[PDB]
C-alpha cells in the first residue's frame, strides 16, 4: 500500500552512506514534480513505433487503432487523433510503458 | 462539459492543421534509446496467444 511506499522511501533516505553528515559542505536535494499533460501529449504513431518492440505487431496495431475513434456527447461528435483514450481497459499498460521511456531520458542509461 | 468539448474539438483540429509537434530527431533519439535499453536487458517480446495458451 502507498503508506508502505512512504515508509520504505523514508528508510531508503535514512540508510544511505553518511547521509546526514554536513561537516564538509555536502547537500541533500529532494525533487518532487509532475509530468504536465502526460495523457494528452502522446502521439499515436510514436506510441505504435515504441510499442512494436515489446509485443506482436497486430497487438500494437489494435492498441493504436482503439485510440482513433469518435467521441460523442449528446450532440457533439469529434474524432481523436492526439493523446490516448485514458478510460480504456489496457490503457493502464500504455501509461506505465511510455513513462518508462521518460526514465531513460531523466535518469540516464548508465544510472 | 460542452465548453471542454468545444476546447478539445478545437485543439484536435489545431493538431491536424499545424502538423506533428514532435521533430524527427527527438523521435530517433527516444527510439534508439528504447532499442539500447531493451537490448541491454535481453527482453523477449510478448507473443500472440496462438490457439491454446492453457491460461
Amino acid at each position: 500500500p502507498p503508506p508502505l511506499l512512504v515508509y520504505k522511501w523514508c528508510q531508503g533516505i535514512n540508510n544511505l552512506q553518511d547521509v546526514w553528515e554536513t561537516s564538509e559542505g555536502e547537500c541533500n536535494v529532494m525533487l518532487e514534480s509532475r509530468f504536465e499533460k502526460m495523457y494528452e501529449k502522446i502521439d499515436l504513431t510514436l506510441l505504435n513505433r515504441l510499442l512494436r518492440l515489446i509485443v506482436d505487431h497486430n497487438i500494437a496495431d489494435y492498441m493504436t487503432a482503439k485510440n482513433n475513434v469518435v467521441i460523442n456527447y449528446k450532440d457533439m461528435n469529434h474524432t481523436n487523433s492526439y493523446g490516448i483514450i485514458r478510460g480504456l481497459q489496457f490503457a493502464s499498460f500504455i501509461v506505465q510503458y511510455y513513462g518508462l521511456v521518460m526514465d531513460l531520458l531523466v535518469l540516464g542509461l548508465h544510472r | 462539459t460542452r465548453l471542454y468539448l468545444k476546447a478539445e474539438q478545437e485543439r484536435q483540429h489545431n493538431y491536424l492543421k499545424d502538423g506533428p509537434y514532435i521533430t524527427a530527431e527527438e523521435a530517433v533519439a527516444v527510439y534508439t534509446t528504447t532499442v539500447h535499453w531493451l537490448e541491454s536487458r535481453r527482453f523477449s517480446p510478448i507473443p500472440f496467444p496462438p490457439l491454446s495458451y492453457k491460461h
Partner: peptide, 22 residues
C-alpha cells in the same frame, strides 16, 4: 505489419508524417 497510417490525415499532414516517422 503494414504500418498504421491513421484514419484522418490530410495531404500535407500525411507528407509530414511520412517524412518524420519513416
Amino acid at each position: 505489419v503494414q504500418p498504421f497510417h491513421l484514419r484522418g490525415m490530410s495531404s500535407t499532414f500525411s507528407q509530414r508524417s511520412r517524412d518524420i516517422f519513416d
